[model samples]
Target: QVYDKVVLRGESPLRWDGENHPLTFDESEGLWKSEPVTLSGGIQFEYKFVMDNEWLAGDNLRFQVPQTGDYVFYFDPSDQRKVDVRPVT
Candidate 1:
């Protein structure tokens, strides 16, 4: 028997590691364009801004981990308050 895996996708925040400080987007460009990354299981991820300080979804954003590794989460400074990706766990 084969079981299907659940795949999640969406746009969220971009943050810096260690500091928990939000990253800044290029004002001239208006927003930051993150490269699409593929997960170990052939999962593709992408994200973009949908509104001021808000992602396409109110809280959830698309994210996929290729393998078990240490990762720090954060978001752009402008939208830091909308969602805090600070390592809580």
Candidate 2:
């Protein structure tokens, strides 16, 4: 079976709650990477972005997993943000 992968990349100076958070891209290599994940057959996955407790633009996506294994998630260093994953139960 073949599994699909999604990668997110962007630059910083991210604005949250009317405040701008300048990220130290060079220090953090201007990139963020997520853990490699494997999906269980028939299981769906969803991911979102959390910026300083606020959800940013294009904050969500949904897809189905074809198999089970490890997966990785990453963010562009220029962007200082966190990704949240939850199953829609």
Candidate 3:
């Protein structure tokens, strides 16, 4: 396992009720996935991904939820982490 745990937190809903949005790492899939959640609003909220208490890909990460799509996120393989956040389409 590469991380102890992963958390996904944002300004809106504060986790549907003041809880955390932790993801489950998939060893075989080489990715992390979160459980079903609820969120509502149009405000520009902020958020980031945390692994072992450090921010990684995922950004100040503002969006209006205007649409939906599949996204990939992960920490860097090199030491120069947090360098940037990019995804392939």
Candidate 4:
């Protein structure tokens, strides 16, 4: 129901490494979470989740930040359709 590893990979501004930007499991929250990262605002950025070096299927997932600042990424392996991001508050 879950993967052994999950990482973020995408275009410029974000480092695309299968093992570098790894997410950690949060059992209480039931989500894979990443450390806060800075991203440019108002521009669309595409990304995909990787499981143990295996990239996710389908087209690249896209997101845009409201403004530039630290943000955290979340992915639910149980529901692969939903990926989310939120500013660090």
Candidate 5:
């Protein structure tokens, strides 16, 4: 079941996970983003998507940010498998 929200949770600021802390949804552009995070030199990170805050066991789809810049990410609640992150500007 697809809803009206898709949140992003990862080591963006390298602080919390989706289980507890997650970035809010931006309806203006149908994107989810958070404030600039501070990542130390030489470190690894990961993230995932959840619909309605109800996630399954196999919903963990983590990946690197690719580059240090602004980007747009997406995840389809209908399929629970459709996820895409694009570079913005």
Candidate 6:
């Protein structure tokens, strides 16, 4: 089934609220993006996309924030297995 909305959920810093962090689709980029978020450096965190009340069907995806900076998250709906993270430069 197709879901209309996608949200980011996981450990602290990122609220687990299903509606709190929705990703918006970017037409030009062909990706969904979250608002810039500030994360501390050298700490690992986990997160997953929740769609219309359904959480992604997999173990939580993890990443270690490389530094303290505003980072944006992006993922392609067609292939959710990978999420790209980039610091706001």
Candidate 3's displacement at residue 46, Å, is 2.1
Q: TM-scores for all candidates?
A: 0.25, 0.40, 0.54, 0.88, 0.53, 0.88
Candidate 1 residue lDDT tens string, 1-89: 01111121243223311212233444574433223322332233343333333344444454454553333333344452233222222
Cα lDDT tens digits, model 2, 1-89, are 01122233222212223323222222344343443344465555555434334443564444455555544444442343444322232
- Per-residue lDDT, model 1, residue 87, is 22
User: What tens-digit string does per-residue lDDT give for candidate 5 at 1-89?
Assistant: 24555456666553334434444556675545444444333334555665566553464565455566655555544445544655566
Candidate 3 on 1-89: residue-level lDDT in tens?
Answer: 57787766666544422237777776775666555444344445455667777765544656454323333334332431332222223
Model 1 TM-score, 2 decimals: 0.25
Decoy 3 TM-score against native:
0.54
- lDDT at 61 for candidate 2? 47
- Pairs of residues clashing in candidate 5: 11-14
What does candidate 4 score on TM? 0.88
- Name the lDDT value of residue 38 in candidate 6: 82
Clashes of each: 4, 19, 0, 0, 1, 0
In model 2, what lDDT does residue 10 have? 26
Error of 2 at 73 (Å): 1.6
C-alpha local distance difference test of each model: 0.33, 0.38, 0.51, 0.79, 0.51, 0.79
Score residue 77 of candidate 3 by CA lDDT.
29
Task: Check candidate 4 and list the clashing pairs.
Answer: none
